[PDB]
Amino acid sequence: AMDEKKKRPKVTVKVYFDLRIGDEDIGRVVIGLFGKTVPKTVDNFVALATGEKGFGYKDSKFHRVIKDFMIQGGDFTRGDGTGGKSIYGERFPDENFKLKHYGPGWVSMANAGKDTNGSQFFITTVKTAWLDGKHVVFGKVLEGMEVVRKVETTKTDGRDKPLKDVTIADCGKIEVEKPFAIAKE
Ligand SMILES: [Zn+2]
Ligand SMILES: [Zn+2]
């Protein structure tokens, strides 16, 4: 079907992450970001990817990995899940819950309850509907889902911490010439 009448979010900007497991380069993940739907949340993530406020994601780790669920990172202050901050302060409100965790590859803010978004985020590896309405969804992996799956399946300990550090070796912003809609899947 052409799906003329299905409602869809638009990718307005992209971020790339070049990832490593231990000292091995494993490839690039490119995330499309929904800047018309959740501008405040996207602007935070993009600024943290560029490092332009003097802090950000470069060389931070994915400190919590759960196979058949998600990979979580973004704690660039403590690297353990206790830290991170947004460009608006330590915490900012949930912007909206317009988007859901529709399937593998959706990118969403980690939190410790209502209105506690900072810098930590996760990339789902399955549909995670139980987080809908609780975590703010703001992007989707468009390239490099296979690289996400390498992280997803890395050996972890009983606290879900990778045995070898999984790091964002490089990251930044990629401009999108013309915003484009994607399926809610
Ligand atoms: Zn080596
Ligand atoms: Zn939660």
Residue numbers in the entry: -1 to 183
Sentences from the paper on this structure:
CypB is a peptidyl prolyl cis-trans-isomerase (PPIase) found in the endoplasmic reticulum (ER). CypB plays a significant role in the triple helix folding of collagen. It catalyzes the slow cistrans isomerization of multiple proline residues in the collagen chain. Here, we present the crystal structures of recombinantly produced wild-type and HC-mutant CypB from the horse.
A missense mutation in cyclophilin B (CypB) has been identified and pointed to a causal candidate gene for HC. The mutation alters a glycine residue that has been conserved across vertebrates. The HC CypB molecule demonstrates the same overall structure with the exception for the very short N-terminal region that precedes the mutation site (rmsd = 1.31 Å for 8 equivalent Cα positions). The catalytic site remains undisturbed in the HC CypB molecule. Strong electron density is observed for all N-terminal residues of HC CypB. The Gly6->Arg mutation in HC CypB appears to endow greater stability in the N-terminal region, as residues Ala(−1) to Arg6 in the HC mutant structure have higher occupancy values for residues (~0.7 vs. ~0.5 for wild-type) and significantly lower refined B-factors (5–12 Å2 vs. 9–20 Å2 for wild-type). Thus, the Gly6->Arg mutation causes significant change in the structure (up to 4.2 Å shift for the backbone at residue Lys5), with the wild-type side chain density of Lys5 being partially occupied by HC Arg6, and the flexibility of the N-terminal region sharply reduced. In HC CypB, the binding interface is altered: CypB overlaps with the P-domain, when superimposed, such that it could adversely affect binding. The Gly6->Arg mutation in HC CypB has two consequences; first, it adds an additional positive charge to the polybasic stretch, which is involved in the binding of the polyacidic region in calreticulin and thus can enhance the affinity, second, it significantly distorts the geometry and flexibility of the N-terminal tail and thus can slow down, limit or even eliminate binding-competent conformations. Binding of lysyl hydroxylase 1 to HC CypB is fully abolished, which establishes a more important role of the N-terminal tail and a stronger requirement for the N-terminal tail flexibility.
